[PDB]
Amino acid sequence: MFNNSSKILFITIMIIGTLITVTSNSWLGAWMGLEINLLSFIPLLSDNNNLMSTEASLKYFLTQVLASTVLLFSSILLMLKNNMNNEINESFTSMIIMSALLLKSGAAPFHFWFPNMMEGLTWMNALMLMTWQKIAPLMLISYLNIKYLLLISVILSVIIGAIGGLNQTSLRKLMAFSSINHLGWMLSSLMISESIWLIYFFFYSFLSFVLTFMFNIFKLFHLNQLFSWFVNSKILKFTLFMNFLSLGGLPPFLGFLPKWLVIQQLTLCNQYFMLTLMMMSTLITLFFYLRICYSAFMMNYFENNWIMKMNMNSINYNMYMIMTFFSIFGLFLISLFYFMF
């Protein structure tokens, strides 16, 4: 996505606008930063070579400006009812604020734009979409204290995001549906902590960088395209596909750690039924992760024989192999970590 320096300019201004959003002490400067982030994320997610990217940017524009005007209208309504930004007893205007934030984030009652837009993108604007663009709404969700909207969103996110990814054989829509399920674990962590959410979001972001770099360097967009992917040693293809088992939450790899910290903090906060509802609905996520892992866990395949050289970037794959090592051997660093406490 670095074909121009103007895209680097749009990247730093969308970083600036997101930081204006998450540091605003009022409900209107947050909307100001949301509009800055929207202005800088319209030209990214748009390109001349791909036809679907322009209508996907149209879908993003209509979804975000529908969500931002409802966010502005409800914040002005809250300010008209009580003139401070906070609220003593929570009421329906906070529900409209949280629903407008859930349309921005992509919770499962309002998530239907997310994989339908994801069906026509590249793998770097998807990396910006499921990681950085989830910063601006989710950090405003932590300011509200209503429980049942978060409960409905978490439950609907972990059933709908896990079941709906089974039919999808495109890798982008499957990763969007997997990010919808990993969104629900972040909102379940938001009801109990503002630090365990940062733990889950940072390592989910880390897993998103290391897993979307596999599909961006080698240009993989399909489940059948993974079977035809040529790696010179099949042990390396087997080892590189352990990031799916890592992100699915398996104990020897990293990615078990943030889910485990969410489990540890939720049980200490006496919330057991919602945890069971999420973890019976996270096995389906590992099922469509293991359906990807059909293409590497067996050691020999009926490969197409016209391609015999593996072509790859140098700097991007050099950054990829550092993060693949810490995705599967990163549980040795739990003794050095001190940010859980």
Partner 1 sequence: ISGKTMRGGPRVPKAAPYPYKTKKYSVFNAIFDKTSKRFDENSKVICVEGPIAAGKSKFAKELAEELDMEYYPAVDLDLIYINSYGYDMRKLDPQLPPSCRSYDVRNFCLDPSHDLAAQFQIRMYMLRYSQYIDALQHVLSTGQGVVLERSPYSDFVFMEAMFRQGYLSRGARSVYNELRQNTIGELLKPHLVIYLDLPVDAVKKQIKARNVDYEVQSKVFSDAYLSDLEQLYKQQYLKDISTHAELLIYDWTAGGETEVVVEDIERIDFNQFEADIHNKKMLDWRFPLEAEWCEARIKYCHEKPDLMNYFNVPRFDVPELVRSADDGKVWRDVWFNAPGMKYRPGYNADMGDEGLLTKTKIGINQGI
Partner 2 sequence: SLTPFLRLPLTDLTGCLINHQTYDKCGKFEMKMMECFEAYGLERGKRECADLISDFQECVGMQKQLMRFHAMRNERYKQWLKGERKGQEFFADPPRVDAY
Partner 3 sequence: MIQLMLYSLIITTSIIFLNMIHPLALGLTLLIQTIFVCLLTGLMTKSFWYSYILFLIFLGGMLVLFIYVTSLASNEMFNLSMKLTLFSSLILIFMLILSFIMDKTSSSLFLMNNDMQSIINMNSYFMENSLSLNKLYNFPTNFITILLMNYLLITLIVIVKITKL
Its sign, for the CA torsion 165, 130, 32, 150, is: positive
Out of 6, 270, 300, 314, the only residue in the binding site for partner 3 (CB under 8 A) is 6
CA–CA gap between residue 110 and residue 90 (Å, rounded): 22
Choices 40-48, 150-158, 241-249, 300-308 (CB under 8 A): range interacting with partner 3: 40-48
Show contacts of 70-78: CB within 8 Å, 24+ apart.
Answer: 70/96, 70/99, 70/100, 70/103, 71/31, 71/34, 71/97, 71/100, 71/101, 71/104, 72/28, 72/31, 74/100, 75/27, 75/28, 75/31, 76/28, 78/27
Choices 34-42, 70-78, 128-136, 177-185 (CB under 8 A): range interacting with partner 3: 34-42
Interacting residues with partner 2 (CB under 8 A)? 16, 19-20, 22-29, 32-33, 80-86, 88, 139, 142-143, 194
Residue 269 site contact among partner 2, partner 3, partner 1, none (CB < 5 to 8 Å, cut-off depends on kind) = none
* Comparison of 6 and 311: residue with beta carbon closer to partner 3: 6
Nearest to 131, CA basis, from 170, 179, 97, 86: 179
* Comparison of 142 and 239: residue with beta carbon closer to partner 2: 142
* Comparison of 33 and 248: residue with beta carbon closer to partner 2: 33
Residue 222 site contact among partner 1, partner 3, partner 2, none (CB < 5 to 8 Å, cut-off depends on kind) = partner 1
Is 43 an interacting residue with respect to partner 3 (CB under 8 A)?
yes
Residue 232 site contact among partner 3, partner 1, partner 2, none (CB < 5 to 8 Å, cut-off depends on kind) = partner 1
Residue 308 site contact among partner 3, partner 2, partner 1, none (CB < 5 to 8 Å, cut-off depends on kind) = partner 1
* Comparison of 28 and 70: residue with beta carbon closer to partner 3: 28
Residue 270 site contact among partner 1, partner 3, partner 2, none (CB < 5 to 8 Å, cut-off depends on kind) = none
Q: How far is the CB of 204 from partner 1 (least distance, A)?
A: 27
Q: How far is the CB of 15 from partner 1 (least distance, A)?
A: 17
DSSP, collapsed to helix, strand or coil, labels residue 142 as coil
Is 97 an interacting residue with respect to partner 3 (CB under 8 A)?
no
Question: Could you tell me which residues are beta bridge partners of residue 170?
Answer: 222
* Comparison of 23 and 318: residue with beta carbon closer to partner 2: 23
Residue by residue, DSSP assigns 206-224 as HHHHHHHHHHHHTT--BHH
Taking CA atoms, 223 is separated from 167, 209, 226, 283, 295, in Å, by: 12, 19, 5, 19, 8
> How distant is the alpha carbon of residue 235 from its chain centre?
29
CA–CA gap between residue 128 and residue 124 (Å, rounded): 6
Residue 13 site contact among partner 1, partner 2, partner 3, none (CB < 5 to 8 Å, cut-off depends on kind) = partner 3
User: What count of other Cβ atoms lies within 10 Å of the Cβ of residue 27?
Assistant: 19
Q: How far is the CB of 43 from partner 3 (least distance, A)?
A: 5
- Binding positions for partner 3, rule: CB under 8 A: 6, 9-10, 13, 36, 39-40, 42-43, 46, 48, 57
